Design a protein around this nucleic acid. Structure first.
Lengths: 583, 374, 86
DNA sequence: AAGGGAAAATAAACAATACATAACAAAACATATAAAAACCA
DNA sequence: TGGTTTTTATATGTTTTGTTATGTATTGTTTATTTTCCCTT
C-alpha cells in the first residue's frame, strides 16, 4: 500500500535542526550575488510597508462599497407608502453579485424576517416554501426569547400565534441560475398571501445580467403582478467607475513620489480590466499587487526610494545605473552642447565621487503627475458634475499628453482646457523607479495563453529541454538524444500534419519511420545488466516492438491531455483530433 | 495533405470529407503483439534512461524558481502549475522539501502539515478530503441555526471557516497540494466549489497542477476570484508512470478512465496472500449477489444491495481460515477501505454491508487476472 | 386581397400564446402530465426538465385539436374560415 | 482564354449512437424513544 | 444502593444526488449524380 496510490494522504515532514541563519525571507541576493544581506532585508520591510499601506486603504474602500449598498437598498426597501396595499414592492438589483448582506429595521410591533433563497435551495416549489416557512418560524422564535407545519398557513396564523404583524422579505440570490418555472410558480404561490391583512411581502431579485432576459422567461401574467411597484437599482462595482477610481487612486497615493507607472503598464491594466466586467476590483487589485511584488523582487534599486539608504551607494550600483537610456541621452546632450571633455568625464566613472554625487540630486523631485491627476479628477468632478469617467484612462492619457483630446468628449471643458493643460517631462533615471511590462511577465503569470503554451512546448520543445553537448557522450543515451526527439514532441508533429480522423495503425507506421532503427537497438543493448531486456533485443522483431510500446504511451498521454478522441466505441481503430495549434 | 496546418484556417481546411476508397482502413491487429510485462520492461527503461540528463538539468534550472513561488504563496496567491509531462515529482519535492520547512522557520517546533491530494486517482472523494482537513484545522463545528434545513454541511462549514480565519493572524498552517486538479473525479463541480471557497482562507496555501488542455474552462469568474491563481509553465516531458497506473495503457486509454478498478488491479499485485484470499472471497460472494438480483448481463456498477454484510462475511472467512475473529477481519478490511476498493455502510435495518464499487464485467475480469492464480 | 386587420406584435402575442397553453390547446411536446402514483410525481418534481430551461419561443409544442377538426367547429361566416384548410 | 476533371455538394437509404427522462437507489440530513451507562447523592 | 440525567442503539422519515434503461431523435456512412472553379494546355 504505497502513498502514491492512495488519495489524500498527509505528510508531517521532517525539518532540519537549524540552518544557522535568519535568512528566511523569499527575496534573493541580486546583482548576481553582489548585494549585501542588509539590503535584502531592507527591501523586504520597505516592500511590506508599501504593500500594507495599499491594502489598509483598499480594505477601507471595500467596506464602503457594502455600507453604501446596504444603505442604498434600505432607502428603497422602506417607506414606499402605496395606497392600494395589495401587492409586493419588487427590487431588481441590476448586475449585483449575491454577496451583499441586507439589514432590516428593528421597528417594533412588526416582525421583519429576511428569507434568502439560492438556486440550489430551490429544486421545486415545495422546497422553496418549506425553507421559507422554516426560516421565518426559526427567526421569530429567536426574537421571542409547539410545532408548526411549514406551509403558507403559518402566514395566516402569524398574528394569532405571535401577536405582532409580519413583514417578510425574499432575497433570491442567483436568479439567473434558478429555473424560471419554479420561481414563477412561487411568486404565484406568494400571491395567495394578500388576503391576510397583516403581512407584506417584498421580493429582491439579484439579476446578474439583465432585466430583458428575465421578462422573456416569466409568464406574462406574472410581470403584470411585478409591475404594481418595482424599482430598478443598478448595483455594480463598474457603474460610474467610482470604486475602480478609488482603488487606483489609493495605489497612486502609495507610490506617489517613489514609483512611476509606464503607459505600457497602465493600458495593460486598462485592457485586461475590460475583459472581466463582473469582478473588476479584485482583478484590478491583483494586477497592481503582482506588479508591485515583481518590482521589489527584481530591482536592487528598490531600496533607493527612501532617502536614508542613499548614503550606502556602492560600485556595482554605479555600473548598472549608467546604462539607463535617459542617462545616455543626457551625456549625448552634453556632447552636442559643450565641446570640452572634462565635465563629461567628471560625470562618468573615471570620477569616482562625481557620479554617485550626481544620483543624490535627482531622487528628491516630486515627479508631480500623481498629484496633478488627483487635481484633475477632483476639479473635473465638482465643477462639471461629471461622474462617468475612468481615472485609469485619465491617468493613461495624461502620461501621453492627450489630456485635452480626452476631455473634449464631454464638450463642457472648453473654458477649462487651458488651465488643466499639462505636458509631462521625462525625468532622469526614471527607468530604475518604474512599473512597466516590456518583458511580458503579467500576461504570462496572470493571463497566460494556456493552451498555446502547451502546443508550443509540444511542437517546438527545443525551448524547453536543454540541448547540452559535453555531458551526453558520457551518459547512456546521449548518442540517441541528438538524433531522437522526446516522444510527446515527436508524435505531436505527426499529429499536427494529419487530418481530422486518423487511423491508429497508419499513425503508428508514420511515427515509426521517424525513429532511428540502429541507435534505438544500440541504446536498448547498452545496458548489460538487464538480461530480460537484452533477450528482447536479440529478437528480429525488436525495433517493431520497442516502437509500439513507445508509441502507445504517448497516444495514451495525448488522450488525458485532451488532444485525441477515440471515435466510435466498439471499434477502437481510428481517432479524431481535438486540438489545433494557434486557435 | 492540407495546405493550412494551424489557425481556424487549419481547423476549417483539415476537416474535409474523405472518400471511401481514400480511407485506408487498417485494423490495429496488424501490430506486434506485445506482452504486458515487456511493455513495462521497455517503458521503464526509456523513462529512466532516454533523456534523464536534459530533464535533470532542466529540473535544476526551475529549482531556482522556488523562492519566487514562496513569495507568491505568502501574498495570498494560489499557484497552478501547467505544462507537458508529469508535474508530480516536481510538486511534492517543492512542497515537502522546500516549502514546508521554510514557512515554519519564517514564522518564528514542527513543520506545517502538508496534505497532498492525488487527483489522478478516480476515487478521490470530496467528503473524505474535507474529513481530513477538519482533523488538521479542528474548526468549530456547525450550530443548528447555521445548518439551514438540509443545507450542505461541507460547504456551510467552509463558509463558517472563512469568517473565522478573516480575523486570525496571517500564518500558513496547512499546505494542500493538489496533483492533477483537472483529474477525473476532481474536475466535478462540487469538488471545485469546495477547493475554491477553501482557497479564500489565507491561512492555507494551495499548490495545484493541471494536465488537460481545456483546464481553464473549469473556472468561471467567481471561482477564478476565490482561487486567484498565478500560473506557471513547467514543461519537463516527464513520463507520468504513477498517473498511468489508475488507467490501462495497454488499451491506449479507452479503459473508461473513471472505473478505479484498473488502479485496484495494481494494488492487489503487492499484498499478503491472506489479504488476497479475503478480497477474492469478497468478490466471489458479491458476484453471486449481482447475478441473482440484477438478472441482467449489462454493466451496472456494484452497490449496497449486492454487497455482503459484515457478520455474514466473518462466517465466510472463518471457514476458509482467513480471519480468526471480528477484529482481525476489520483490521485487514480497512486497508481496502482507505484505498476505496471496498466500502462499508449500514442499511435501513442496521445490517453493516460490505461491498465493492465496481461493475460486474470489471469484477469478473479482476477475479481472473490477479486473484485466481494463487 | 382586401377595413384592415391589425397585426399584433411579437411581444403581444406572447400573452395569447400562454393562454392557449393553459386552456389545453397546446401541450408540451413529449409531456407526461399527471403521474400514476405519489412516488412518480415526487421523482418528477426533483427532475429539472429541458423545456423549462430552453427559452420561451424555442419550446416545441404539440396540438390538442387538429386543423381538420378545427375547420368543422368554426362557422363558415368567419374571416378565418378560409385558413382552416391548406 | 478554354477546358479537363477532381474536389465539393446533394440526395437518399440505412445503420449506429446519443439524448431526455423515468424509475430508482443510496447517502446525507434529521428526529424519536427505550435501554444502557454514568453519575451525583 | 438509588434516583436522575445523559448517551447510545435501534428505528424510521426527508431531501439531494447520482446511476441506469430505454424509446425516440440525431448523426454518420455509403453510393449515385451534379456543379465549381484550379491547374494544365
Amino acid at each position: 500500500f504505497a502513498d502514491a496510490q492512495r488519495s489524500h494522504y498527509t505528510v508531517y515532514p521532517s525539518l532540519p535542526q537549524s540552518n544557522k541563519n535568519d535568512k528566511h525571507i523569499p527575496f534573493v541576493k541580486l546583482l548576481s550575488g553582489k548585494e549585501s544581506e542588509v539590503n535584502v532585508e531592507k527591501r523586504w520591510e520597505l516592500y511590506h510597508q508599501l504593500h500594507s499601506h495599499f491594502h489598509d486603504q483598499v480594505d477601507h474602500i471595500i467596506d464602503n462599497i457594502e455600507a453604501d449598498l446596504k444603505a442604498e437598498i434600505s432607502d428603497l426597501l422602506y417607506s414606499e407608502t402605496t395606497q392600494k396595499r395589495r401587492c409586493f414592492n419588487t427590487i431588481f438589483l441590476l448586475g449585483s453579485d449575491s454577496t451583499t448582506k441586507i439589514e432590516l429595521k428593528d421597528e417594533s410591533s412588526r416582525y421583519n424576517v429576511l428569507i434568502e433563497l439560492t438556486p440550489k435551495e430551490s429544486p421545486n416549489v415545495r422546497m422553496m416554501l418549506r425553507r421559507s416557512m422554516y426560516k421565518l418560524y426559526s427567526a421569530a422564535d429567536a426574537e421571542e426569547h409547539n410545532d408548526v407545519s411549514y406551509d403558507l398557513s403559518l402566514v395566516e396564523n402569524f398574528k394569532r400565534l405571535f401577536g405582532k404583524d409580519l413583514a417578510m422579505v425574499f432575497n433570491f440570490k442567483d436568479v439567473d441560475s434558478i429555473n424560471f418555472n419554479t420561481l414563477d410558480n412561487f411568486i404565484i404561490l406568494l400571491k395567495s398571501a394578500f388576503k391576510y391583512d397583516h403581512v407584506k411581502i417584498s421580493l429582491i431579485f439579484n439579476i446578474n445580467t439583465n432585466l430583458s432576459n428575465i421578462e422573456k422567461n416569466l409568464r406574462q401574467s406574472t410581470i403584470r403582478l411585478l409591475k404594481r411597484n418595482y424599482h430598478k437599482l443598478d448595483v455594480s462595482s463598474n457603474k460610474g467607475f467610482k470604486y475602480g477610481n478609488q482603488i487606483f487612486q489609493s495605489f497612486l497615493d502609495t507610490v506617489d513620489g517613489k514609483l512611476n507607472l509606464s503607459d505600457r503598464f497602465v493600458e495593460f491594466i486598462l485592457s485586461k480590466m475590460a475583459n472581466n466586467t463582473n469582478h473588476n476590483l479584485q482583478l484590478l487589485t491583483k494586477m497592481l499587487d503582482y506588479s508591485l511584488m515583481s518590482y521589489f523582487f527584481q530591482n536592487a534599486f528598490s531600496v533607493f526610494i527612501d532617502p536614508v539608504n542613499v548614503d550606502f551607494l556602492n560600485d556595482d550600483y554605479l555600473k548598472i545605473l549608467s546604462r539607463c537610456p535617459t542617462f545616455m541621452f543626457f551625456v549625448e546632450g552634453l556632447i552636442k552642447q559643450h565641446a570640452p571633455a572634462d565635465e563629461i568625464l567628471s560625470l562618468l566613472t573615471n570620477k569616482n565621487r562625481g557620479l554617485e554625487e550626481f544620483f543624490v540630486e535627482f531622487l528628491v523631485r516630486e515627479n508631480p503627475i500623481n498629484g496633478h491627476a488627483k487635481f484633475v479628477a477632483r476639479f473635473l468632478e465638482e465643477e462639471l458634475n461629471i461622474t462617468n469617467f475612468n481615472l485609469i484612462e485619465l491617468y493613461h492619457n495624461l502620461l501621453i499628453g492627450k489630456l485635452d483630446s480626452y476631455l473634449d468628449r464631454w464638450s463642457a471643458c472648453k473654458e477649462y482646457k487651458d488651465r488643466l493643460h499639462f505636458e509631462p517631462i521625462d525625468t532622469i533615471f526614471q527607468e530604475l523607479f518604474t512599473l512597466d511590462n516590456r518583458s511580458g511577465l503579467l500576461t504570462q503569470s496572470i493571463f497566460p495563453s494556456y493552451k498555446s503554451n502547451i502546443e508550443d512546448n509540444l511542437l517546438s520543445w527545443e525551448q524547453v529541454l536543454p540541448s547540452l553537448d559535453k555531458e551526453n557522450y558520457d551518459t547512456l543515451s546521449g548518442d540517441l538524444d541528438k538524433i531522437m526527439a522526446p516522444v510527446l514532441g515527436q508524435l505531436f508533429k505527426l499529429y499536427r500534419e494529419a487530418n481530422m480522423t486518423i487511423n491508429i495503425y497508419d499513425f503508428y507506421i508514420a511515427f515509426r519511420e521517424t525513429l532511428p532503427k540502429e541507435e534505438i537497438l544500440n541504446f536498448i543493448r547498452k545496458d548489460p545488466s538487464n538480461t530480460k531486456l537484452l533477450e528482447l533485443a536479440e529478437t528480429p522483431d525488436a525495433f517493431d516492438k520497442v516502437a509500439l510500446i513507445l508509441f502507445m504511451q504517448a497516444i495514451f498521454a495525448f488522450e488525458n491531455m485532451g488532444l485525441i478522441k477515440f471515435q466510435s466505441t466498439k471499434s477502437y481503430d481510428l481517432v479524431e483530433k481535438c486540438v489545433w495549434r494557434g486557435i | 495533405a492540407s495546405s493550412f496546418l494551424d489557425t481556424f484556417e487549419g481547423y476549417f481546411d483539415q476537416r474535409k470529407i474523405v472518400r471511401t476508397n481514400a480511407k485506408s482502413r487498417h485494423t490495429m491487429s496488424m501490430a506486434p503483439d506485445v506482452t504486458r510485462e515487456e511493455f513495462s520492461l521497455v517503458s521503464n527503461f526509456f523513462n529512466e534512461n532516454f533523456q534523464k540528463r536534459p530533464r535533470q538539468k532542466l529540473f535544476e534550472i526551475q529549482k531556482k524558481m522556488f523562492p519566487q513561488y514562496w513569495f507568491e504563496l505568502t501574498q495570498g496567491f494560489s499557484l497552478l502549475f501547467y505544462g507537458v509531462g508529469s508535474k508530480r515529482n516536481f510538486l511534492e519535492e517543492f512542497a515537502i522539501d522546500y516549502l514546508s520547512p521554510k514557512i515554519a522557520y519564517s514564522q518564528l517546533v514542527n513543520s506545517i502539515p502538508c496534505l497532498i491530494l492525488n487527483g489522478y486517482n478516480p476515487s478521490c472523494n470530496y467528503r473524505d478530503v474535507f474529513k481530513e482537513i477538519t482533523d488538521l484545522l479542528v474548526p468549530a463545528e456547525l450550530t443548528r441555526s447555521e445548518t439551514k434545513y438540509w443545507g450542505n454541511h461541507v460547504i456551510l462549514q467552509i463558509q463558517k471557516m472563512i469568517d473565522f480565519y478573516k480575523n486570525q493572524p496571517l500564518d500558513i498552517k496547512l499546505i494542500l497540494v493538489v496533483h492533477n486538479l483537472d483529474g477525473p473525479s476532481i474536475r466535478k463541480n462540487t469538488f471545485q466549489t469546495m477547493l475554491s471557497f477553501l482557497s479564500v482562507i489565507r491561512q492555507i496555501a494551495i499548490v495545484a497542477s493541471t494536465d488537460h488542455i481545456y483546464a481553464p474552462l473549469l473556472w468561471d469568474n467567481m471561482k477564478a476570484q476565490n482561487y486567484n491563481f498565478v500560473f506557471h509553465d513547467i514543461s519537463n516531458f516527464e513520463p507520468s508512470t504513477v498517473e498511468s497506473t489508475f488507467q490501462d495503457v495497454m488499451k491506449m486509454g479507452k479503459s473508461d478512465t473513471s472505473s478505479g478498478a484498473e488502479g485496484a488491479k495494481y494494488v492487489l499485485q503487492s499484498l499478503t496472500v491472506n489479504s488476497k484470499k479475503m478480497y477474492k472471497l469478497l468478490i466471489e460472494t458479491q458476484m453471486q449477489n449481482m447475478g441473482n438480483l440484477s438478472a441482467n448481463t449489462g454493466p451496472k456498477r456494484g452497490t449496497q444491495r449486492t454487497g455482503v454484510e459484515l457478520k455474514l462475511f466473518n462466517h465466510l472467512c472463518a471457514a476458509d481460515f482467513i480471519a480468526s475473529n471480528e477484529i482481525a477481519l476489520r483490521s485487514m478490511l480497512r486497508e481496502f477501505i482507505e484505498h476505496k476498493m471496498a466500502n462499508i455502510t449500514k442499511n435501513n435495518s442496521g445490517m453493516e454491508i460490505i461491498w465493492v464499487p465496481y461493475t460486474y464485467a470489471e469484477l469478473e475480469k479482476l477475479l481472473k487476472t490477479v486473484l485466481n492464480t494463487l | 386581397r382586401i377595413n384592415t386587420i391589425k397585426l399584433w406584435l411579437k411581444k403581444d402575442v406572447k400573452n395569447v400564446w400562454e393562454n392557449l397553453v393553459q386552456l389545453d390547446f397546446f401541450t408540451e411536446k413529449s409531456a407526461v402530465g399527471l403521474r400514476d402514483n405519489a412516488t412518480a410525481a415526487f421523482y418528477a418534481s426533483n427532475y429539472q426538465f429541458q423545456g423549462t430551461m430552453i427559452p420561451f419561443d424555442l419550446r416545441s409544442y404539440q396540438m390538442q385539436i387538429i386543423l381538420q377538426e378545427l375547420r368543422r367547429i368554426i362557422p363558415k361566416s368567419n374571416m378565418y374560415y378560409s385558413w382552416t384548410q391548406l
